[PDB]
Design a protein around this ligand. Structure first.
Ligand SMILES: CCCc1nn(C)c2c(=O)[nH]c(-c3cc(S(=O)(=O)NC(=O)OC(C)C)ccc3OCC)nc12
Ligand SMILES: [Mg+2]
Ligand SMILES: [Zn+2]
Length: 332
């Protein structure tokens, strides 16, 4: 607080209470569990796909004992959406997609579902919801490169992830948003640790490390769901898969999520205007489809291949990635 830095490009948390939007029915019960969910399409014709998804998840997983708790969750989600920037990719639509994705993967894994506690389900849902809150549409490396105050505040790996986590807790701390206020001090602590773990592990830098760790877990026999640390690890793997898994939901849906390149193009341009070195691979490439291939082979496919070995019933995402790769490979 003594060193002189430039103003941050990340916006401070907005604690203001904002009227929640109308939660239009966004599909069937089977539809919400379906990996084929098209988040952009829904956002297309409803007031808020994030708030509609959030409420359907809370109701499907029996989150509330009283209408009071339910109202706080509704106000919370509304305020979380009020804290997502209008980015091409890292926006409230991405958050909704990850929330529904997490909800979809978890409920597709019978054993994990048969063992998850109601508190772990709330924590997983809340984490998916807030995992990218206040994201500025610029990477952790860019924040460091421009010496953004948030890089100095949150030291070590995952600058943004740490910020998303703290922000989610500041919001949850607002009385009208605190749907967990009736929780015991011990339960709330378990809640925070779970949430902190889930969001922290969305940090892309941990990829090599996590794939290796989960591969070792697989060799030892996979997840023992009667063990809470194991359920935490499992949730962590599924949340992550959901976060980077839009391209596994189907060819047509994958096409809609190529907006990530728009954020890349923007950062590349931002860097040029600042006179900084341009991030490799961020400027628009000659062929979008073919540049996607090494990224799917390196990050996405391995993730869903491992996920399929740890939860043998979850096969759809991997087959879709393959169909997608084949299409990109054929492209001229
Ligand atoms: C930086 C070049 C790597 C890359 N190539 N391509 C095609 C993609 C791509 O399509 N997406 C990403 C990507 C990169 C990120 S990122 O966290 O902003 N950058 C990042 O951390 O990259 C890692 C390797 C350090 C986040 C999401 C991404 O995909 C959306 C799920 N990275 C790449
Ligand atoms: Mg993120
Ligand atoms: Zn994300």
């Amino acid at each position: 607080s003594t060193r002189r830095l430039p103003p941050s490009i990340v916006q401070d948390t907005i604690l203001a209470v904002v009227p929640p939007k109308s939660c239009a029915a966004i599909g069937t019960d089977v539809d919400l569990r379906d990996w084929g969910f098209d988040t952009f399409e829904v956002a297309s014709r409803v007031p808020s796909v994030l708030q509609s998804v959030a409420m359907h998840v809370a109701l499907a997983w029996d989150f509330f004992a009283s209408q009071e708790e339910a109202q706080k969750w509704a106000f919370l989600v509304a305020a979380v959406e009020n804290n997502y920037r209008p980015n091409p990719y890292h926006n409230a639509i991405h958050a909704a997609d990850v929330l529904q994705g997490t909800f979809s993967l978890v409920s597709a894994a019978k054993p994990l579902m048969e063992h998850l506690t109601p508190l772990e389900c709330k924590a997983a849902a809340f984490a998916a919801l807030t995992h990218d809150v206040c994201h500025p549409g610029r990477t952790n490396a860019f924040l460091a490169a421009v010496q953004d105050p948030v890089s100095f505040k949150f030291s070590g790996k995952g600058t943004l992830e740490q910020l998303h986590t703290a922000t989610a807790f500041e919001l949850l701390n607002v009385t009208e948003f605190d749907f967990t206020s009736s929780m015991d001090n011990a339960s709330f602590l378990e809640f925070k640790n779970i949430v902190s773990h889930l969001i922290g592990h969305t940090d892309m830098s941990l990829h090599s490390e996590t794939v290796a760790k989960h591969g070792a877990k697989l060799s030892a026999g996979g997840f023992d769901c009667t063990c809470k640390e194991d359920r935490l690890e499992a949730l962590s793997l599924l949340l992550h898969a959901a976060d980077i898994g839009a391209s596994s939901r189907g060819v047509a849906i994958a096409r809609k999520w190529l907006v990530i390149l728009q954020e890349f193009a923007d950062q590349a341009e931002d860097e040029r205007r600042r006179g900084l070195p341009v991030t490799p691979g961020f400027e628009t490439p000659s062929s979008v489809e073919k540049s996607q291939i090494p990224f799917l082979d390196f990050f996405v496919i391995p993730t869903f291949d491992l996920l399929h070995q740890l939860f043998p019933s979850i096969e759809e995402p991997l087959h879709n990635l393959r169909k997608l790769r084949e299409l990109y490979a054929a492209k001229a």
